[PDB]
Amino acid sequence: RSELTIHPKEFTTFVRNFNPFLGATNLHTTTDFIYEPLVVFNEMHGNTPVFRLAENFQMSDDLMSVTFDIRKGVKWSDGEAFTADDVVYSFNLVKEKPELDQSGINSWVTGVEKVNDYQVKFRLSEANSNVPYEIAKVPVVPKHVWSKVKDPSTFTNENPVGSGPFTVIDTFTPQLYIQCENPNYWDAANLDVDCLRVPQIANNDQFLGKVVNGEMDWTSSFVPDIDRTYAAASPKHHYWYPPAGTQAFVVNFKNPDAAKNEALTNVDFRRAFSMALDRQTIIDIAFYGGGTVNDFASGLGYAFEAWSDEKTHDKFKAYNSYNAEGAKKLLAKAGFKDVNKDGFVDTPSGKSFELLIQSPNGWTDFNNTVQLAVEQLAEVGIKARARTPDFSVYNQAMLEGTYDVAYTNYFHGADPYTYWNSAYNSALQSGDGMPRAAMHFYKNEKLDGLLNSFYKTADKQEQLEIAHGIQQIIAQDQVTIPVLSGAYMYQYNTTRFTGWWNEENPKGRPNIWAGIPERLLHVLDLKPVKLEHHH
Ligand SMILES: CC(=O)N[C@@H]1[C@@H](O)[C@H](O[C@@H]2O[C@H](CO)[C@@H](O)[C@H](O)[C@H]2NC(C)=O)[C@@H](CO)O[C@H]1O
Ligand SMILES: [Ca+2]
Ligand SMILES: [Ca+2]
Ligand SMILES: [Ca+2]
Ligand SMILES: [Cl-]
Ligand SMILES: [Cl-]
Ligand SMILES: [Cl-]
């Protein structure tokens, strides 16, 4: 039997938890691989829908409702029948318990109803023509189970009943678990992989040793000097790094320290911070050239240059370009003066301060970015130092607003909305299932208004104009400090399997992370290599 060795997420130890709604504590082979979505949107290729457990969808009248045609003939892993009430239950479960909304679905779908056994209708809080994409983000769980569970909020779901291709827990150790083919998988014919083999790997260092020794199949980790360390180790070691989303330094607007709050809430300081940074050098040293300078004050990025209002871009690009003397003169003009002779600037009220900059433990490319930033900042007289907390500590500090500055990446869509909405919609700064992206706690009502209306009208020109408005608001206030546009790191080994996506076969986002539903489509294309013979 063919075992595919994947690595979606670092863990120090595996804790059995396959609850699809617990993204911050579950195992990361749960969405897609255990719970198949209704539709997979191919984000790299214009968000083209690939219909899965749903056959078709159709929006309404006024962009204010939608129906999904549930495919019949689809059975759960236990034997039961995938139907509309599963969808129905699932969506009610998220409105009842908004802790389980990881997407923001509850601010869109205002109710959900079983048209019949194979059709569901959703009604909206407002016109959003992109709401089928949002709808697809919600996990759909078997009603004949989850309805009767004590607390879904804490159900660890250790023997999952799933619709996806890999639902069987074959083995489970704290250092290894193997996930095996659903015996009622509807697309079983298309599937040529037996099992998912998930080893426990805690950081990029432990990962490095395995991957260069040919021990992995499908991974998406950072690999330093990848040509001379991994590519050079075997001709079987391949990779494909298509362009990804924005990475930025995010500053806390609600920092509880008086002195730090005084610096971070000041647009002149954020701009000076930004001008102190040498973006291309960060890309070259920390990422070994694997990235693109982002000198958009709005964070838009060169992948979306087509969307860009070039007036706005040019007006603020100087604040987002390496210029240490410019940084120093801005600090002086703004009044951040060193008044206690240590060479580091103090706030307008005369207070000394040091910025603690955080990135997740083990994410070494980001750790080294922060450390380059600390030195670049010191050259213009801004005192800072690095911290590398465990991801969950890192994440919590942002949700709780206790951090000073955080370096982070964002999810990346087929248009600027995925980035701009997740990074700036102030509604996403509240709610316990919310990711870290918006947690700068900068709030602008006009901005939320523009974000909320982006898919409200089918006018391509008007929509572009809304994007110009968003771009201008964010750039003027230098809300974050955008640094670069990164890559979808992806490594594959041709030793044991074939059919991989790559430059000559770019079928979609190739990565194995949770939050890349396309990985479901990717594993279906994979096929074992004929290595040995019968007798
Ligand atoms: C948008 C987002 O948050 N993506 C997360 C990934 O960045 C993250 O992958 C990790 O990315 C680090 C930063 O480049 C890498 O150094 C690290 O190797 C990589 N880890 C793995 C296992 O690929 C993943 C997993 O932590 O979570 C994504 O959501
Ligand atoms: Ca296939
Ligand atoms: Ca098969
Ligand atoms: Ca000082
Ligand atoms: Cl901009
Ligand atoms: Cl484009
Ligand atoms: Cl366009």
Residue numbers in the entry: 1 to 535
Quote the study that presented this structure, word for word.
VcCBP and VhCBP belong to cluster C/subcluster IV (C-IV), members of which are specific for oligosaccharides, including mannooligosaccharides, cellooligosaccharides, and chitooligosaccharides.
By contrast, the reduction in hydrophobicity in the F437A mutation may not only have weakened hydrophobic interaction with the N-acetyl methyl group of the reducing-end GlcNAc at the site 2 but also added a conformational restraint to Phe411. These subtle changes resulted in a rather large impact on ΔG° (ΔΔG° = +4.1 ± 0.3 kcal mol−1).
